[PDB]
Symmetry: C2
Subunit: 307 residues, 2 copies
């Protein structure tokens, strides 16, 4: 593909939602272009994925490879770059590869995970550290684990891990949690979840795999070394509010791109799917992102053919 080329649809992103949208877009015979920064999106940080029906215990890197193969079967051009602006046909401007034209746009830009950044985090990646509790909980049956964070992701994470794991240490830097009351009350009733409030993780330690987390109480300055086999980092996600505003796309009060049932945004001709949207907000899974991508491609098809 070359700058100035026109497409029926341009899909922004390269995570599950974008692959899902590209497969349906191409099969509708829509001239499709995918422009995304990182192939696989957040799957680049996952280990084994066993929650996508039909792909049993697949390495996340192999899921990304087969998702790409599926869209390439239909010769969908994929450009690795960042989309900086979407102007209204639509002109999509990228950072390094120029501008492209499109009759419709599908946003599958997801959300950025809020980073922790402590020593041992990168060294133990794939060896005890996980960024998804619901995804990996079955893997820590009868292991002691720690969950870091205090929003819904963290509390729901501690709730499912408490069912599987020996014990969960729920560590959060504030005095109270910010998750929904119903989640805090449910977790509070688990005898094997211990709240470690007013604390931060100083380091994650181990040999071949994770074995301990060093925690500091911000109020007393006291240090604790907890013996754990897994550390689940669940501090949250930042939605693409600035990108949306910059491009005149409405966001809900949570900062997510607002869509209706059919994945339509506030801008006619612009649809969205996956983690970046207000649909099924808080449930972030490959299966739902791929399905939303199919729906957004279907709404883009109806839009383009009718235009």
């Amino acid at each position: 593909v070359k700058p100035g080329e026109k497409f029926d649809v341009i899909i922004v992103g390269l995570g599950p939602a974008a692959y899902g949208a590209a497969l349906y877009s191409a099969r509708y015979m829509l001239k499709t272009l995918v422009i995304g920064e990182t192939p696989g999106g957040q799957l680049t940080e996952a280990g084994i994925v066993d929650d996508y029906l039909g792909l049993i215990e697949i390495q996340a890197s192999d899921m990304i490879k087969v998702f790409n193969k599926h869209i390439e079967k239909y010769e969908v051009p994929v450009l690795l770059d960042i989309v900086e602006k979407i102007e209204n046909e639509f002109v999509v401007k990228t950072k390094r590869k120029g501008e492209f034209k499109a009759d419709s746009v599908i946003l599958g830009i997801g959300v950025k995970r809020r980073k922790l950044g402590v020593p041992g985090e990168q060294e133990f990646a794939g060896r005890g550290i996980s960024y998804c509790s619901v995804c990996d909980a079955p893997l820590f049956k009868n292991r002691v684990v720690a969950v870091i964070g205090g929003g819904d992701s963290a509390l729901e994470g501690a709730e499912i891990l408490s069912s599987y794991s020996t014990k969960v240490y729920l560590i959060h830097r504030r005095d109270t949690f910010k998750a929904q009351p119903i989640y805090v009350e449910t977790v509070k009733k688990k005898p094997n979840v211990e709240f470690v409030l007013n604390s931060v993780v100083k380091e994650i330690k181990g040999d071949k795999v994770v074995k301990q987390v060093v925690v500091e109480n911000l109020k007393t300055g006291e240090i604790k070394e907890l013996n754990v086999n897994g550390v689940f980092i669940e501090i949250g996600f930042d939605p693409p509010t600035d990108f949306a505003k910059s491009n005149g796309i409405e966001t809900d009060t949570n900062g997510y791109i607002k869509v209706d049932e059919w994945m339509r945004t506030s801008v006619p001709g612009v649809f969205a799917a996956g983690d970046c949207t207000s649909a099924w907000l808080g449930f972030r899974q490959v299966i739902t992102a791929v399905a939303q991508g199919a729906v957004a491609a279907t709404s883009a098809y109806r839009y383009v053919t009718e235009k």
Copy 2:
């Protein structure tokens, strides 16, 4: 399992939505039982599936096997039988007794309206299809017929016009009942031919479909059209009788009414897939499986908070 045994969740049905709900329910460590009549649901009548991301050109029967393998990896017990009533909840089956549950997930789908003409059953999988969005790519440069007059028929003719050399759109009434926007859009296609006030009398061929015999109900004329494929898009029967029999609210089209989180009108009963009011008109394996995950999540939230 044994009659009278209790579960956190009982899943009714064994199509893609049920398998999707089962995977997530089991992964939420919920004690789960699936009771469905036919393994695979409508997938038993599908050919090759190439629209479910990650499973490239998979035979419908093979998708049924890997979906079953996946939930059996979590040791989910599966009973093959009919659920007769949903009275905690008491789920009464036809031959395996009653079972109790804290929540229920309905993945009962809908039945395809049948045409019932000679050659139909004989040529299934040999030129006959019931899903245009699914099989259109297989008919590039071929001639096809679409039978029907609703939105699925019109959109199907539109998708097929982008692949096939010629598309006959056959419908028994003087007008189509699909959205006018669909009718006007398709009309412009140079390779689509409306064949109104007509019915198909026979679908014939040799090893595969080669012709459709059509009767014009006004002009009385009987003609044969050579086609390589026949897409039957005449709709489905909603699950209304079962819904009303079980006190479940339906939408204005007779489908099980659900909210964004797949919750039905009855607290603790959720639903997923074709049988629901969600994304009505779009009936695909990927969306059914996703709705099942959402319904399982809502059931998990319900039970853990119950």
